[PDB]
């Protein structure tokens, strides 16, 4: 849970594909609906994330994106260390499962509001990142605190 | 500028449209290529920005987006105060002009690398936010908002 470490997570809703990056130390996320989880989609998503936050390491969500030359090229371009996402600490899988369930619940709670899934996913990213836990600091507050504490030391 | 204030900027390249949000105090940006600058696209862009960073106020880039009920609805949903983008300080026009020129120069420098403009714009966002000016814009926005939290 160093300041630069993120995890990719791909979840499905009604067969549409939601790709999520979770900053491990804070639980802050960014997410997008994508047409299918291809190398090309994941690479582009990682390029966006790393221009916006200081992404040092990413634990990839599966072996296809770990292997993908397109994902490796974007990781090289953006100075990201690509790593596997094997849950050596088994509590990792349950934390990700619980986030996906939370995200899907919020999506459901905004269905009277968003015509397209992509809006509902961004409403969910907003409510996730601003939720005070359960501190009570939010994930958005913690990621900024963590990275700023890192700049002032290293 | 206060830690929550952002400015929208829309620039064109090839007749494709690039929409940029600039965090005024730091110069950090996020940007997207969009098919045309509609209320719906601007609104969606603001909803994404405000889920990622604490967006208190946005200076909108033109009167159409200031007026748009779709943009006002996103601003209401995301708790953003919508403001005009009138350069009461005329040096603002120039700072945004220069950033657009710098963004387009980076886009040009990555032509041998990105097949699609959308990739080039995100490589430009990356190089802009990491460039040491010596802190980078990315460092400054985190510093600014963290000072505000504490
Ligand atoms: C995503 C990323 C960062 C944030 C975020 N940073 S500071 C902050 N707060 C500032 C102090 C209380 N006022 C509003 C909350 N919130 C929120 C979502
Ligand atoms: C977008 C948003 C934030 C950043 C960002 N924050 S801290 C950081 N570091 C840059 C160099 C490595 N360690 C010193 C601090 N860089 C970069 C781009
Ligand atoms: Cl693929
Ligand atoms: Cl793509
Ligand atoms: Cl290949
Ligand atoms: Cl849209």
From Swiss-Prot, chain A:
Q: Where in the cell is it found?
A: Virion; Host nucleus; Host cytoplasm
Question: Taking every annotated instance into account, which residue ranges of this chain make up the domain Integrase catalytic?
Answer: 1-147
Residues in coiled coil: none
Q: Which residues bind Mg(2+) 3?
A: 9, 61, 97
> Domain of life here?
Viruses
Q: What does this protein do?
A: Catalyzes viral DNA integration into the host chromosome, by performing a series of DNA cutting and joining reactions. This enzyme activity takes place after virion entry into a cell and reverse transcription of the RNA genome in dsDNA. The first step in the integration process is 3' processing. This step requires a complex comprising the viral genome, matrix protein, Vpr and integrase. This complex is called the pre-integration complex (PIC). The integrase protein removes 2 nucleotides from each 3' end of the viral DNA, leaving recessed CA OH's at the 3' ends.
- Notes concerning its domains: The core domain contains the D-x(n)-D-x(35)-E motif, named for the phylogenetically conserved glutamic acid and aspartic acid residues and the invariant 35 amino acid spacing between the second and third acidic residues. Each acidic residue of the D,D(35)E motif is independently essential for the 3'-processing and strand transfer activities of purified integrase protein.
Summarize the subunit comment: Homotetramer; may further associate as a homohexadecamer. Part of the pre-integration complex (PIC) which is composed of viral genome, matrix protein, Vpr and integrase. Interacts with human SMARCB1/INI1 and human PSIP1/LEDGF isoform 1. Interacts with human KPNA3; this interaction might play a role in nuclear import of the pre-integration complex. Interacts with human NUP153; this interaction might play a role in nuclear import of the pre-integration complex.
Q: What is this protein called?
A: Integrase
Q: Tell me what organism the protein belongs to.
A: Human immunodeficiency virus type 1 group M subtype B (isolate NY5) (HIV-1)
Covered residues, full protein: 1203 to 1358 of 1435
